[PDB]
Design a protein around this ligand. Structure first.
Ligand SMILES: *[C@@](O)(C(=O)NCc1ccccc1)[C@H](C[C@@H]1CCCNC1=O)NC(=O)[C@H](CC1CCCCC1)NC(=O)c1cc2ccccc2o1
Ligand SMILES: [Ca+2]
Ligand SMILES: [Ca+2]
Length: 322
């Protein structure tokens, strides 16, 4: 079983608050400026203007922990440079066993609610159970940091808060490497591929890793500080972590074409080239494969041919449990 982070015992704390008729207040990570950050999100920073702390039960009538599953569409980046972490969370949702360890299902804002939630994180070689109270940073009535596409779903906001807590602040998460999130969610180890010097069986490696439930991510190198977050003509984002979420071969124009699916953790802004949501390539695939694979939705998720993926992306990471 998990070690209790800072000795905090989720069930004992929840039970005490429920018996006291009160809501949990986390003395280890309070709703104070220092929990937001120290410089860019520091006390005298314009970027913290109007940010307040509110529980979901102070925001909406029927807040939910999980709605329609804990899935990758629940991961929509906010105003914090933690794309690496959010790509890791989205990839985690594809591994059902690890997802249910990291995110204890059954926590609720209704029955048994006492303003306290918990998550499991892999930290310094061990699983640890991290509690948070459910006060979250809000500006203009909306979550400022990660949020779900479902406006009344909070498991991912609370998971990001727990990750901030073990790092001391939200700002501590701004700028990072996806491998750290992958490993902190799985206990596995990340292998890095330079796509210019990829083995000839990389596609099969990707297929098998997705099938096993490994966590995969990819990115485009920057050439200078100016390329950071630059949006290309075909609406890829440079210096930005993507989740690799699928891979399938389809019959197309008399050949077998290998496709790969990835997801921008913004939850919006997608590739516009071949195999994009509205591209003409789907006209020439099997109608069942078209129905199984293609979703016409601005959700950050899209397909590319493996050939285009190797032309446009620079790096791939595969975090295997093994
Ligand atoms: C990511 O694209 C993101 O969070 N975008 C939304 C956003 C951007 C800016 C402000 C708020 C929200 C980030 C964006 C950068 C981080 C924040 C500061 N300015 C940015 O452009 N991109 C990263 O975090 C990249 C992602 C990695 C993923 C693995 C492959 C390489 C790119 N990482 C860094 O920028 C980074 C990583 C590390 C590690 C150690 C020290 C410093 C550092 O910086
Ligand atoms: Ca959901
Ligand atoms: Ca899409």
């Amino acid at each position: 079983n998990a070690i209790k982070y800072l000795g905090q015992d989720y069930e004992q704390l929840r039970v005490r608050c429920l018996q006291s008729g009160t809501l949990f207040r986390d003395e280890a990570f309070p709703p104070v400026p220092q929990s937001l950050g120290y410089k860019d999100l520091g006390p005298n920073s314009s970027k913290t203007y109007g940010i307040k702390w509110k529980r979901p039960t102070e925001l909406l009538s029927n807040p939910q922990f999980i709605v329609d599953g804990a899935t990758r569409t629940d991961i929509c980046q906010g105003a914090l440079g933690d794309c690496w972490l959010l790509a890791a969370i989205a990839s985690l949702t594809l591994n059902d066993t690890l997802l249910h360890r990291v995110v204890p299902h059954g926590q609720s804002f209704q029955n048994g609610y006492a303003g306290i939630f918990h998550f499991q994180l892999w930290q310094f070689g061990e699983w640890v159970d991290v509690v948070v109270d459910d006060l979250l940073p809000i500006k203009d009535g909306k979550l400022v940091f990660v949020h779900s596409a479902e406006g009344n779903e909070f498991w991912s906001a609370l998971l990001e808060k727990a990750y901030a807590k073990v790092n001391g602040s939200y700002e501590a998460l701004s700028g990072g490497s996806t491998s750290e999130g992958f490993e902190d969610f799985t206990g596995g180890v990340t292998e890095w591929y330079e796509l210019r010097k990829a083995p000839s069986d990389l596609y099969q490696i990707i297929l098998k890793a997705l099938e096993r439930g490994s966590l995969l991510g990819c990115s485009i190198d920057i050439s200078s500080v100016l390329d950071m977050e630059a949006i290309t003509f075909k609406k890829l984002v440079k210096g930005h972590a993507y989740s690799v979420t699928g891979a399938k071969q389809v019959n197309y124009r008399g050949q077998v074409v290998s496709l790969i699916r990835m997801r921008n953790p913004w939850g919006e802004v997608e590739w516009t080239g071949a195999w994009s949501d509205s591209s003409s390539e789907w006209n020439n695939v099997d109608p069942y494969e078209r129905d199984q694979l293609r979703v016409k939705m601005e959700d950050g998720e899209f397909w590319m041919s493996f050939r285009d993926f190797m032309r446009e992306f620079t790096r791939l990471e595969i975090c295997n449990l093994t």
